[PDB]
Curated annotation (Swiss-Prot):
Induction: By troglitazone and pioglitazone (selective PPARG agonists), by prostaglandin J2 (PGJ2) and by L165,041 (a PPARD ligand), by vitamin D3 and, to a lesser extent, by phorbol myristate acetate (PMA) in the promyelocytic leukemia HL-60 cells. No induction by retinoic acid, nor by clofibrate (a specific PPARA agonist). Up-regulated by fasting. Changing K70E: Abolishes interaction with ADRB2. Adapter protein that plays a role in regulating cell-surface expression of adrenergic receptors and probably also other G protein-coupled receptors. Plays a role in NEDD4-mediated ubiquitination and endocytosis af activated ADRB2 and subsequent ADRB2 degradation. May recruit NEDD4 to ADRB2. Alternatively, may function as adapter protein that does not play a major role in recruiting NEDD4 to ADRB2, but rather plays a role in a targeting ADRB2 to endosomes. Changing K42E: Abolishes interaction with ADRB2. It comes from the Eukaryota. Changing K50E: Nearly abolishes interaction with ADRB2. It is found in: Cytoplasm; Cell membrane; Lysosome; Endosome. This is Arrestin domain-containing protein 3. Changing K118E: Abolishes interaction with ADRB2.
Length: 149
């Protein structure tokens, strides 16, 4: 069998922008011909900030992780032998972002803030296939409140 395509998509028009408290939902999309044996399909979602600065002249950098979510969508972490059959497969995933403040996605001279989901397809006697896809976070969008009578 052969993996013909492996992609990540985010469920939503515009591309979804996320913020504190939001659920990020998406899928790992896999197209296969024939059959393939897999150990696991894993996802790893992460948000982090990295910054750079100079001091009289020794250069420094600092990193902070905002969250780190891991999930096994197929198989088992041990290194299961699940079989993916001919056709198209969309493996759903979802996770919730922290409710506390999250820095806006950013790339600049002095540093960056990045959020992403990484998918890993692990197969017997083969190197993992790894794919990353960024998603955009805004610190401030629209705070939804509810009122009751």
């Amino acid at each position: 069998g052969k993996v013909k395509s492996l992609t990540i998509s985010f469920d939503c028009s515009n591309v979804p922008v996320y913020s504190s408290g939001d659920t990020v939902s998406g899928r790992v999309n896999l197209e296969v011909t024939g059959e393939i044996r897999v150990k696991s399909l894993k996802i790893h979602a992460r948000g982090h900030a990295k910054v750079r600065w100079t001091e009289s002249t020794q250069n420094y950098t600092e990193e902070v992780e905002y969250f780190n979510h891991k999930d096994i969508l197929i198989g088992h972490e041990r290194d299961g032998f699940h079989t993916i059959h001919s056709g198209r497969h969309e493996y759903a995933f979802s996770f919730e972002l922290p409710q506390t403040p999250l820095a806006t996605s950013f790339e600049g001279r002095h540093g960056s803030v990045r959020y992403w989901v990484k998918a890993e397809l692990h197969r017997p006697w083969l190197l993992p296939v790894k794919l990353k896809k960024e998603f955009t976070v805004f610190e401030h969008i629209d705070i939804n409140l509810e009122h009751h009578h």
